[PDB]
Amino acid sequence: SATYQFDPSHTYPSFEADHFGGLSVWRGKFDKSSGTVTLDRAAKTGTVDVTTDIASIHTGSAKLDEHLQTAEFFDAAKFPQANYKGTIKFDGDKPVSVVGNLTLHGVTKPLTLKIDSFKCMPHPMLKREVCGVDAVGEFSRDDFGLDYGKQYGFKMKTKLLITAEAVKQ
Amino acid sequence: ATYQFDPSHTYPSFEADHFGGLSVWRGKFDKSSGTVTLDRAAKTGTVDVTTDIASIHTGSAKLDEHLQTAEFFDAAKFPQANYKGTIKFDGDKPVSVVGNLTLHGVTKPLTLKIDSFKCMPHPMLKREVCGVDAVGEFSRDDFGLDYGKQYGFKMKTKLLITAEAVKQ
Ligand SMILES: CC(C)=CCC/C(C)=C/CC/C(C)=C/CC/C(C)=C/CC/C(C)=C/CC/C(C)=C/CC/C(C)=C/CC/C(C)=C/COP(=O)(O)OP(=O)(O)O
Ligand SMILES: CC(C)=CCC/C(C)=C/CC/C(C)=C/CC/C(C)=C/CC/C(C)=C/CC/C(C)=C/CC/C(C)=C/CC/C(C)=C/COP(=O)(O)OP(=O)(O)O
Protein backbone atom coordinates (compact mmCIF):
# COMPACT_ATOMS: atom_id res chain seq x y z
CA SER A 1 0.00 0.00 0.00
CA ALA A 2 1.15 3.47 -1.04
CA THR A 3 -0.05 7.09 -1.05
CA TYR A 4 0.67 9.44 -3.91
CA GLN A 5 -0.03 13.17 -4.45
CA PHE A 6 -1.12 14.40 -7.89
CA ASP A 7 1.39 16.53 -9.70
CA PRO A 8 -0.70 19.48 -10.79
CA SER A 9 1.51 20.25 -13.81
CA HIS A 10 0.60 16.81 -15.28
CA THR A 11 -2.99 16.36 -13.94
CA TYR A 12 -5.82 17.80 -15.99
CA PRO A 13 -9.36 16.89 -16.89
CA SER A 14 -9.99 17.65 -20.51
CA PHE A 15 -13.45 17.52 -22.02
CA GLU A 16 -15.50 17.19 -25.19
CA ALA A 17 -18.93 18.81 -25.45
CA ASP A 18 -21.39 19.26 -28.37
CA HIS A 19 -21.90 22.38 -30.39
CA PHE A 20 -25.26 22.81 -32.29
CA GLY A 21 -26.32 19.24 -32.38
CA GLY A 22 -23.28 17.67 -33.89
CA LEU A 23 -21.94 20.58 -35.90
CA SER A 24 -18.66 20.35 -34.10
CA VAL A 25 -17.01 19.37 -30.83
CA TRP A 26 -15.94 21.85 -28.12
CA ARG A 27 -12.70 20.68 -26.61
CA GLY A 28 -10.91 22.20 -23.63
CA LYS A 29 -9.56 21.51 -20.15
CA PHE A 30 -9.34 22.79 -16.56
CA ASP A 31 -5.82 23.96 -15.75
CA LYS A 32 -5.83 23.61 -11.89
CA SER A 33 -6.33 20.28 -10.04
CA SER A 34 -4.97 18.67 -6.90
CA GLY A 35 -5.45 15.58 -4.74
CA THR A 36 -4.37 12.20 -3.54
CA VAL A 37 -4.32 8.58 -4.72
CA THR A 38 -3.93 5.51 -2.59
CA LEU A 39 -3.02 2.24 -4.24
CA ASP A 40 -2.47 -1.32 -2.84
CA ARG A 41 -1.56 -3.37 -5.96
CA ALA A 42 -1.41 -6.69 -3.95
CA ALA A 43 -4.81 -6.15 -2.39
CA LYS A 44 -6.17 -4.94 -5.75
CA THR A 45 -7.64 -1.74 -4.33
CA GLY A 46 -7.06 1.95 -4.16
CA THR A 47 -8.83 5.33 -4.05
CA VAL A 48 -8.83 8.75 -5.67
CA ASP A 49 -9.72 12.16 -4.16
CA VAL A 50 -9.29 15.00 -6.62
CA THR A 51 -10.45 18.58 -6.81
CA THR A 52 -10.56 20.87 -9.88
CA ASP A 53 -10.98 24.72 -9.81
CA ILE A 54 -13.80 25.76 -12.13
CA ALA A 55 -12.17 29.16 -12.70
CA SER A 56 -9.28 27.39 -14.42
CA ILE A 57 -11.35 26.39 -17.45
CA HIS A 58 -9.85 26.98 -20.85
CA THR A 59 -11.98 26.54 -23.94
CA GLY A 60 -10.00 28.51 -26.49
CA SER A 61 -12.41 31.38 -26.12
CA ALA A 62 -11.69 33.75 -23.22
CA LYS A 63 -15.22 35.06 -23.55
CA LEU A 64 -16.80 31.57 -23.25
CA ASP A 65 -14.51 30.81 -20.27
CA GLU A 66 -15.77 33.92 -18.42
CA HIS A 67 -19.40 33.30 -19.35
CA LEU A 68 -19.34 29.73 -18.08
CA GLN A 69 -18.38 30.95 -14.61
CA THR A 70 -21.72 32.77 -14.27
CA ALA A 71 -24.98 31.48 -12.80
CA GLU A 72 -26.15 30.57 -16.29
CA PHE A 73 -23.72 27.67 -16.17
CA PHE A 74 -21.19 26.67 -13.42
CA ASP A 75 -22.06 29.39 -10.85
CA ALA A 76 -18.49 29.37 -9.73
CA ALA A 77 -19.17 32.00 -7.12
CA LYS A 78 -21.26 29.43 -5.20
CA PHE A 79 -19.45 26.31 -6.41
CA PRO A 80 -15.73 27.16 -7.15
CA GLN A 81 -14.61 23.52 -7.27
CA ALA A 82 -15.58 20.13 -8.58
CA ASN A 83 -14.59 17.09 -6.49
CA TYR A 84 -14.34 13.46 -7.42
CA LYS A 85 -13.87 10.57 -5.01
CA GLY A 86 -13.85 6.92 -5.99
CA THR A 87 -12.51 3.40 -5.53
CA ILE A 88 -10.03 1.88 -7.94
CA LYS A 89 -10.96 -1.48 -9.43
CA PHE A 90 -8.52 -3.94 -10.98
CA ASP A 91 -8.95 -6.44 -13.88
CA GLY A 92 -5.97 -8.75 -14.00
CA ASP A 93 -3.01 -7.16 -12.29
CA LYS A 94 -3.71 -3.58 -13.37
CA PRO A 95 -6.16 -0.90 -12.37
CA VAL A 96 -8.94 -0.60 -14.85
CA SER A 97 -11.57 1.75 -13.49
CA VAL A 98 -12.52 4.08 -10.71
CA VAL A 99 -16.10 3.93 -9.41
CA GLY A 100 -17.23 6.89 -7.43
CA ASN A 101 -19.00 10.18 -7.26
CA LEU A 102 -18.51 13.58 -8.84
CA THR A 103 -19.70 16.78 -7.16
CA LEU A 104 -20.08 19.47 -9.82
CA HIS A 105 -22.27 22.56 -9.63
CA GLY A 106 -23.09 21.53 -6.11
CA VAL A 107 -24.68 18.29 -7.16
CA THR A 108 -23.28 14.86 -6.42
CA LYS A 109 -23.83 12.03 -8.95
CA PRO A 110 -22.23 8.66 -9.68
CA LEU A 111 -19.35 8.63 -12.12
CA THR A 112 -17.09 5.81 -13.30
CA LEU A 113 -13.78 6.55 -15.04
CA LYS A 114 -12.22 3.84 -17.21
CA ILE A 115 -8.40 3.66 -17.04
CA ASP A 116 -7.05 3.14 -20.58
CA SER A 117 -3.39 3.18 -19.55
CA PHE A 118 -1.45 2.88 -16.31
CA LYS A 119 2.33 3.13 -15.85
CA CYS A 120 4.63 3.56 -12.95
CA MET A 121 8.30 4.57 -13.08
CA PRO A 122 10.86 6.34 -11.02
CA HIS A 123 10.24 10.09 -11.49
CA PRO A 124 13.10 11.39 -13.68
CA MET A 125 13.57 14.38 -11.20
CA LEU A 126 12.03 13.62 -7.77
CA LYS A 127 13.19 9.97 -7.85
CA ARG A 128 10.18 8.60 -6.01
CA GLU A 129 7.72 6.51 -7.90
CA VAL A 130 5.33 8.33 -10.22
CA CYS A 131 2.22 6.62 -11.48
CA GLY A 132 0.43 7.93 -14.51
CA VAL A 133 -2.86 7.25 -16.18
CA ASP A 134 -5.02 8.12 -19.11
CA ALA A 135 -8.68 7.72 -18.31
CA VAL A 136 -12.07 8.40 -19.81
CA GLY A 137 -15.55 9.07 -18.56
CA GLU A 138 -18.79 10.48 -19.79
CA PHE A 139 -21.80 12.06 -18.13
CA SER A 140 -24.95 13.94 -19.04
CA ARG A 141 -24.41 17.49 -17.82
CA ASP A 142 -28.06 18.12 -17.17
CA ASP A 143 -27.75 15.57 -14.29
CA PHE A 144 -25.65 18.21 -12.49
CA GLY A 145 -28.10 21.05 -13.20
CA LEU A 146 -26.00 22.24 -16.18
CA ASP A 147 -28.60 22.22 -18.97
CA TYR A 148 -27.76 25.37 -20.91
CA GLY A 149 -28.33 24.93 -24.72
CA LYS A 150 -30.77 22.07 -24.29
CA GLN A 151 -33.60 24.08 -25.70
CA TYR A 152 -31.46 24.91 -28.83
CA GLY A 153 -30.51 21.37 -29.90
CA PHE A 154 -27.28 20.95 -27.82
CA LYS A 155 -26.58 17.42 -26.63
CA MET A 156 -25.94 17.00 -22.89
CA LYS A 157 -23.38 14.17 -23.27
CA THR A 158 -20.02 15.40 -22.06
CA LYS A 159 -16.89 13.37 -22.36
CA LEU A 160 -13.95 13.52 -20.01
CA LEU A 161 -10.39 12.73 -21.06
CA ILE A 162 -8.20 12.63 -17.97
CA THR A 163 -4.47 12.99 -17.72
CA ALA A 164 -3.04 12.33 -14.24
CA GLU A 165 0.36 11.76 -12.67
CA ALA A 166 0.83 11.20 -8.95
CA VAL A 167 4.11 11.00 -7.04
CA LYS A 168 4.58 8.65 -4.08
CA GLN A 169 4.97 10.59 -0.77
CA ALA B 1 -19.08 27.37 -52.62
CA THR B 2 -16.60 29.30 -50.45
CA TYR B 3 -16.66 29.37 -46.61
CA GLN B 4 -14.51 31.21 -44.09
CA PHE B 5 -13.50 29.54 -40.91
CA ASP B 6 -15.18 30.96 -37.78
CA PRO B 7 -12.06 31.31 -35.47
CA SER B 8 -14.23 30.95 -32.36
CA HIS B 9 -15.18 27.36 -33.37
CA THR B 10 -12.02 26.37 -35.24
CA TYR B 11 -9.19 24.80 -33.23
CA PRO B 12 -6.56 22.13 -33.66
CA SER B 13 -6.26 20.21 -30.44
CA PHE B 14 -3.50 17.66 -29.88
CA GLU B 15 -2.32 14.71 -27.87
CA ALA B 16 1.31 14.11 -27.18
CA ASP B 17 3.33 11.71 -25.06
CA HIS B 18 4.90 12.34 -21.74
CA PHE B 19 7.72 10.02 -20.64
CA GLY B 20 7.06 7.14 -22.87
CA GLY B 21 3.50 6.37 -22.01
CA LEU B 22 3.32 7.83 -18.55
CA SER B 23 0.58 10.16 -19.50
CA VAL B 24 -0.89 12.16 -22.48
CA TRP B 25 -0.37 15.93 -22.84
CA ARG B 26 -3.52 17.47 -24.29
CA GLY B 27 -4.01 21.02 -25.43
CA LYS B 28 -4.97 23.23 -28.37
CA PHE B 29 -4.02 26.34 -30.36
CA ASP B 30 -6.44 29.11 -29.70
CA LYS B 31 -6.03 31.15 -32.95
CA SER B 32 -6.64 29.88 -36.47
CA SER B 33 -8.02 31.25 -39.69
CA GLY B 34 -8.65 30.25 -43.30
CA THR B 35 -10.90 29.20 -46.06
CA VAL B 36 -12.74 26.11 -47.36
CA THR B 37 -14.06 25.53 -50.87
CA LEU B 38 -16.63 22.76 -51.47
CA ASP B 39 -18.22 21.60 -54.76
CA ARG B 40 -20.47 18.83 -53.47
CA ALA B 41 -21.78 17.95 -57.05
CA ALA B 42 -18.24 17.51 -58.37
CA LYS B 43 -17.27 15.85 -55.12
CA THR B 44 -14.24 18.04 -54.46
CA GLY B 45 -13.13 20.78 -52.22
CA THR B 46 -10.06 22.38 -50.58
CA VAL B 47 -8.82 23.71 -47.25
CA ASP B 48 -6.29 26.44 -46.54
CA VAL B 49 -5.77 27.10 -42.80
CA THR B 50 -3.16 28.90 -40.70
CA THR B 51 -2.66 28.59 -36.91
CA ASP B 52 -0.64 30.85 -34.63
CA ILE B 53 2.02 29.05 -32.69
CA ALA B 54 1.97 31.60 -29.90
CA SER B 55 -1.66 30.63 -29.23
CA ILE B 56 -0.81 27.24 -27.80
CA HIS B 57 -2.47 26.26 -24.48
CA THR B 58 -1.33 23.13 -22.67
CA GLY B 59 -2.52 24.07 -19.11
CA SER B 60 1.03 24.80 -18.14
CA ALA B 61 2.32 28.30 -18.81
CA LYS B 62 5.84 27.16 -18.30
CA LEU B 63 5.43 24.56 -21.02
CA ASP B 64 3.63 26.90 -23.38
CA GLU B 65 6.61 29.29 -23.22
CA HIS B 66 9.22 26.58 -23.46
CA LEU B 67 7.51 25.33 -26.67
CA GLN B 68 7.92 28.78 -28.28
CA THR B 69 11.69 28.68 -27.97
CA ALA B 70 14.30 27.46 -30.46
CA GLU B 71 14.33 24.20 -28.52
CA PHE B 72 10.91 23.50 -30.05
CA PHE B 73 8.66 25.45 -32.38
CA ASP B 74 11.04 28.48 -32.71
CA ALA B 75 8.07 30.86 -32.99
CA ALA B 76 10.41 33.86 -33.54
CA LYS B 77 11.41 32.22 -36.83
CA PHE B 78 8.24 30.37 -37.68
CA PRO B 79 5.16 32.09 -36.05
CA GLN B 80 2.58 30.08 -37.99
CA ALA B 81 1.73 26.59 -39.11
CA ASN B 82 -0.14 26.26 -42.39
CA TYR B 83 -2.08 23.35 -43.88
CA LYS B 84 -3.50 23.09 -47.41
CA GLY B 85 -5.24 20.14 -48.87
CA THR B 86 -7.83 18.60 -51.12
CA ILE B 87 -11.13 17.28 -49.77
CA LYS B 88 -11.97 13.72 -50.81
CA PHE B 89 -15.55 12.39 -50.81
CA ASP B 90 -16.75 8.72 -49.84
CA GLY B 91 -19.78 9.33 -52.12
CA ASP B 92 -22.03 12.15 -51.00
CA LYS B 93 -19.97 13.03 -47.96
CA PRO B 94 -16.48 14.44 -47.38
CA VAL B 95 -14.29 11.74 -45.82
CA SER B 96 -10.72 13.08 -45.76
CA VAL B 97 -8.37 15.95 -46.65
CA VAL B 98 -5.14 15.04 -48.40
CA GLY B 99 -2.48 17.72 -48.24
CA ASN B 100 0.55 19.19 -46.72
CA LEU B 101 1.39 20.71 -43.33
CA THR B 102 4.06 23.34 -42.88
CA LEU B 103 5.18 23.28 -39.29
CA HIS B 104 8.50 24.67 -37.91
CA GLY B 105 9.32 25.69 -41.50
CA VAL B 106 9.13 22.16 -42.79
CA THR B 107 6.47 20.91 -45.23
CA LYS B 108 5.34 17.29 -45.09
CA PRO B 109 2.41 15.33 -46.29
CA LEU B 110 -0.60 15.09 -43.94
CA THR B 111 -4.02 13.48 -44.37
CA LEU B 112 -6.90 14.47 -42.09
CA LYS B 113 -9.77 11.94 -41.66
CA ILE B 114 -13.19 13.59 -41.38
CA ASP B 115 -15.19 11.72 -38.65
CA SER B 116 -18.22 13.96 -38.92
CA PHE B 117 -19.51 16.62 -41.31
CA LYS B 118 -22.76 18.61 -41.03
CA CYS B 119 -24.07 21.68 -42.75
CA MET B 120 -27.00 23.74 -41.43
CA PRO B 121 -28.22 27.27 -41.43
CA HIS B 122 -26.30 29.33 -38.90
CA PRO B 123 -28.65 30.49 -36.06
CA MET B 124 -27.25 34.06 -35.83
CA LEU B 125 -25.58 34.66 -39.21
CA LYS B 126 -28.33 33.28 -41.46
CA ARG B 127 -25.86 31.80 -43.92
CA GLU B 128 -24.87 28.15 -44.27
CA VAL B 129 -22.32 26.83 -41.77
CA CYS B 130 -20.45 23.61 -42.28
CA GLY B 131 -18.74 21.91 -39.42
CA VAL B 132 -16.37 18.98 -39.04
CA ASP B 133 -14.61 16.85 -36.51
CA ALA B 134 -11.42 15.48 -37.97
CA VAL B 135 -8.38 13.58 -36.87
CA GLY B 136 -4.81 13.10 -37.98
CA GLU B 137 -1.49 11.91 -36.74
CA PHE B 138 2.16 12.67 -37.47
CA SER B 139 5.63 12.09 -36.10
CA ARG B 140 6.94 15.43 -34.87
CA ASP B 141 10.50 14.60 -35.60
CA ASP B 142 9.54 14.69 -39.32
CA PHE B 143 9.24 18.49 -38.76
CA GLY B 144 12.46 18.84 -36.91
CA LEU B 145 10.78 18.76 -33.52
CA ASP B 146 12.67 15.99 -31.82
CA TYR B 147 12.90 17.31 -28.16
CA GLY B 148 12.72 14.45 -25.72
CA LYS B 149 13.57 11.73 -28.19
CA GLN B 150 16.85 11.11 -26.35
CA TYR B 151 14.88 10.47 -23.18
CA GLY B 152 12.22 7.95 -24.43
CA PHE B 153 9.47 10.46 -25.50
CA LYS B 154 7.37 9.16 -28.31
CA MET B 155 7.17 11.34 -31.43
CA LYS B 156 3.64 10.35 -32.50
CA THR B 157 1.40 13.36 -32.16
CA LYS B 158 -2.37 13.21 -32.63
CA LEU B 159 -4.48 16.05 -33.99
CA LEU B 160 -8.15 16.43 -33.07
CA ILE B 161 -9.66 19.17 -35.14
CA THR B 162 -12.76 21.18 -34.59
CA ALA B 163 -13.75 23.49 -37.48
CA GLU B 164 -16.77 25.49 -38.51
CA ALA B 165 -16.83 27.54 -41.70
CA VAL B 166 -19.50 30.07 -42.74
CA LYS B 167 -20.50 30.46 -46.37
CA GLN B 168 -19.60 33.84 -47.76
C1 LIG C 1 -2.65 5.97 -10.25
C2 LIG C 1 -3.32 7.26 -10.67
C3 LIG C 1 -2.48 8.35 -11.39
C4 LIG C 1 -4.66 7.12 -10.45
C5 LIG C 1 -5.68 8.19 -10.77
C6 LIG C 1 -6.83 7.61 -11.51
C7 LIG C 1 -7.75 8.68 -12.03
C8 LIG C 1 -8.63 8.17 -13.13
C9 LIG C 1 -7.83 9.91 -11.49
C10 LIG C 1 -8.77 11.05 -11.81
C11 LIG C 1 -8.00 12.35 -12.00
C12 LIG C 1 -8.77 13.57 -12.36
C13 LIG C 1 -8.00 14.77 -12.74
C14 LIG C 1 -10.09 13.55 -12.39
C15 LIG C 1 -10.94 14.68 -12.77
C16 LIG C 1 -12.23 14.65 -12.06
C17 LIG C 1 -13.05 15.90 -12.15
C18 LIG C 1 -13.07 16.79 -10.95
C19 LIG C 1 -13.85 16.03 -13.20
C20 LIG C 1 -14.89 17.14 -13.46
C21 LIG C 1 -14.31 17.98 -14.53
C22 LIG C 1 -15.35 19.05 -14.83
C23 LIG C 1 -15.26 20.30 -14.01
C24 LIG C 1 -16.22 18.90 -15.87
C25 LIG C 1 -17.18 19.88 -16.46
C26 LIG C 1 -17.23 19.69 -17.95
C27 LIG C 1 -18.05 20.70 -18.69
C28 LIG C 1 -19.45 20.59 -18.37
C29 LIG C 1 -17.41 21.59 -19.54
C30 LIG C 1 -18.00 22.73 -20.31
C31 LIG C 1 -18.44 22.15 -21.63
C32 LIG C 1 -18.91 23.20 -22.59
C33 LIG C 1 -17.87 24.01 -23.28
C34 LIG C 1 -20.26 23.28 -22.81
C35 LIG C 1 -20.83 24.24 -23.82
C36 LIG C 1 -21.49 25.46 -23.21
C37 LIG C 1 -21.90 26.51 -24.24
C38 LIG C 1 -22.52 27.78 -23.68
C39 LIG C 1 -21.67 26.37 -25.58
C40 LIG C 1 -22.08 27.43 -26.59
O1 LIG C 1 -20.98 28.22 -27.11
P1 LIG C 1 -20.96 29.84 -27.29
O2 LIG C 1 -19.55 30.32 -27.65
O3 LIG C 1 -21.64 30.41 -26.04
O4 LIG C 1 -21.76 30.29 -28.64
P2 LIG C 1 -22.90 29.61 -29.59
O5 LIG C 1 -24.04 30.61 -29.50
O6 LIG C 1 -22.30 29.54 -30.93
O7 LIG C 1 -23.24 28.26 -29.00
C1 LIG D 1 -16.20 21.93 -44.43
C2 LIG D 1 -15.14 22.10 -43.41
C3 LIG D 1 -15.45 22.80 -42.09
C4 LIG D 1 -13.97 21.54 -43.80
C5 LIG D 1 -12.79 21.62 -42.95
C6 LIG D 1 -12.05 20.27 -42.98
C7 LIG D 1 -10.83 20.34 -42.14
C8 LIG D 1 -10.36 18.97 -41.74
C9 LIG D 1 -10.18 21.46 -41.76
C10 LIG D 1 -8.93 21.56 -40.97
C11 LIG D 1 -8.98 22.69 -39.97
C12 LIG D 1 -7.84 22.88 -39.11
C13 LIG D 1 -7.99 23.83 -37.96
C14 LIG D 1 -6.66 22.31 -39.38
C15 LIG D 1 -5.48 22.51 -38.55
C16 LIG D 1 -4.22 22.18 -39.30
C17 LIG D 1 -2.99 22.76 -38.65
C18 LIG D 1 -2.27 24.01 -39.05
C19 LIG D 1 -2.47 21.86 -37.76
C20 LIG D 1 -1.15 22.01 -37.04
C21 LIG D 1 -1.36 22.11 -35.63
C22 LIG D 1 -0.04 22.12 -34.91
C23 LIG D 1 0.65 23.45 -34.80
C24 LIG D 1 0.47 21.01 -34.37
C25 LIG D 1 1.65 20.92 -33.47
C26 LIG D 1 1.31 19.90 -32.39
C27 LIG D 1 2.33 19.77 -31.34
C28 LIG D 1 3.61 19.18 -31.76
C29 LIG D 1 2.11 20.13 -30.03
C30 LIG D 1 2.97 20.08 -28.82
C31 LIG D 1 2.99 18.75 -28.18
C32 LIG D 1 3.67 18.74 -26.88
C33 LIG D 1 2.93 19.52 -25.82
C34 LIG D 1 4.70 17.90 -26.76
C35 LIG D 1 5.43 17.72 -25.44
C36 LIG D 1 6.76 18.37 -25.59
C37 LIG D 1 7.44 18.39 -24.26
C38 LIG D 1 8.84 18.94 -24.35
C39 LIG D 1 6.90 17.99 -23.10
C40 LIG D 1 7.69 17.99 -21.78
O1 LIG D 1 7.51 19.15 -20.95
P1 LIG D 1 6.83 18.94 -19.47
O2 LIG D 1 5.96 17.73 -19.37
O3 LIG D 1 6.38 20.33 -18.89
O4 LIG D 1 8.25 18.67 -18.81
P2 LIG D 1 8.71 17.91 -17.45
O5 LIG D 1 7.92 16.67 -17.02
O6 LIG D 1 10.24 17.84 -17.35
O7 LIG D 1 8.30 19.08 -16.48
Side-chain angles (χ1 to χ4, degrees):
Chain A
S1 188
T3 302
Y4 303 74
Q5 302 304 330
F6 286 117
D7 171 9
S9 62
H10 297 84
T11 304
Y12 311 84
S14 298
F15 53 85
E16 303 179 353
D18 178 56
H19 190 231
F20 289 164
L23 184 63
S24 70
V25 178
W26 268 105
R27 294 186 171 84
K29 65 190 332 184
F30 291 82
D31 296 350
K32 288 297 329 168
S33 298
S34 63
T36 310
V37 171
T38 68
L39 200 60
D40 186 343
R41 296 169 77 173
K44 287 174 154 42
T45 193
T47 64
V48 174
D49 172 26
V50 58
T51 297
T52 298
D53 283 354
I54 294 298
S56 76
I57 203 171
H58 183 90
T59 64
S61 170
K63 293 303 205 133
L64 178 61
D65 303 341
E66 172 180 41
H67 173 67
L68 293 179
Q69 304 300 303
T70 71
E72 294 189 54
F73 206 86
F74 290 126
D75 207 356
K78 296 189 182 183
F79 310 117
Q81 291 179 318
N83 173 260
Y84 177 81
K85 300 185 176 63
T87 301
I88 301 180
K89 304 307 172 158
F90 282 64
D91 186 14
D93 50 9
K94 284 303 183 281
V96 298
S97 62
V98 191
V99 179
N101 298 94
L102 174 61
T103 307
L104 170 61
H105 190 236
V107 176
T108 298
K109 298 288 158 89
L111 173 64
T112 295
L113 302 176
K114 170 150 130 319
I115 289 174
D116 279 340
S117 69
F118 170 85
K119 182 183 182 182
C120 304
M121 67 187 286
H123 195 293
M125 202 212 284
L126 302 176
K127 309 308 210 256
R128 301 197 305 285
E129 182 170 61
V130 60
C131 297
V133 295
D134 206 52
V136 304
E138 307 185 346
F139 63 93
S140 205
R141 58 176 169 86
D142 56 340
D143 288 356
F144 294 90
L146 300 171
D147 66 357
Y148 183 115
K150 189 157 186 184
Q151 276 340 285
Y152 282 60
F154 278 68
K155 302 305 199 334
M156 290 307 94
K157 184 185 93 164
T158 306
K159 292 168 69 310
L160 298 169
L161 293 87
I162 291 155
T163 301
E165 299 184 0
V167 183
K168 193 174 177 172
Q169 49 182 228
Chain B
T2 304
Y3 302 75
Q4 308 294 344
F5 290 117
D6 169 6
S8 67
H9 296 85
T10 299
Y11 311 90
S13 303
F14 52 82
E15 303 181 352
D17 181 64
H18 188 230
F19 276 109
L22 184 66
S23 71
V24 180
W25 269 111
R26 289 189 175 81
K28 67 185 341 182
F29 296 82
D30 293 349
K31 290 194 45 169
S32 298
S33 63
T35 305
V36 169
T37 73
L38 260 199
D39 183 349
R40 293 181 72 185
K43 287 145 41 46
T44 189
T46 63
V47 177
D48 178 42
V49 59
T50 298
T51 297
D52 291 357
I53 296 292
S55 74
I56 200 175
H57 191 260
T58 61
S60 170
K62 93 174 174 70
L63 176 64
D64 296 343
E65 175 42 44
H66 168 80
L67 293 169
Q68 297 311 296
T69 75
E71 292 272 320
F72 208 96
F73 293 123
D74 199 0
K77 270 207 214 292
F78 306 114
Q80 292 179 311
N82 169 255
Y83 176 79
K84 293 192 316 191
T86 302
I87 297 174
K88 307 301 175 168
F89 283 71
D90 191 353
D92 209 4
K93 202 105 144 178
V95 293
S96 61
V97 192
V98 180
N100 298 90
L101 176 64
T102 309
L103 171 60
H104 187 233
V106 176
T107 300
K108 293 290 156 91
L110 178 67
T111 292
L112 304 177
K113 187 291 200 198
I114 293 170
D115 284 341
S116 68
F117 168 83
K118 177 183 186 204
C119 297
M120 58 190 294
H122 198 289
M124 299 285 80
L125 297 167
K126 312 172 128 194
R127 298 199 307 274
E128 186 175 53
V129 60
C130 296
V132 291
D133 208 43
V135 298
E137 310 193 333
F138 68 89
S139 193
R140 60 168 168 86
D141 49 347
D142 288 349
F143 298 90
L145 297 168
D146 57 11
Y147 198 91
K149 198 173 178 181
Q150 293 308 93
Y151 294 69
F153 280 56
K154 302 188 235 252
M155 300 291 104
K156 176 203 180 180
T157 306
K158 294 173 182 206
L159 289 170
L160 296 88
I161 288 156
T162 301
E164 294 190 356
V166 181
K167 191 164 159 172
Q168 73 183 14

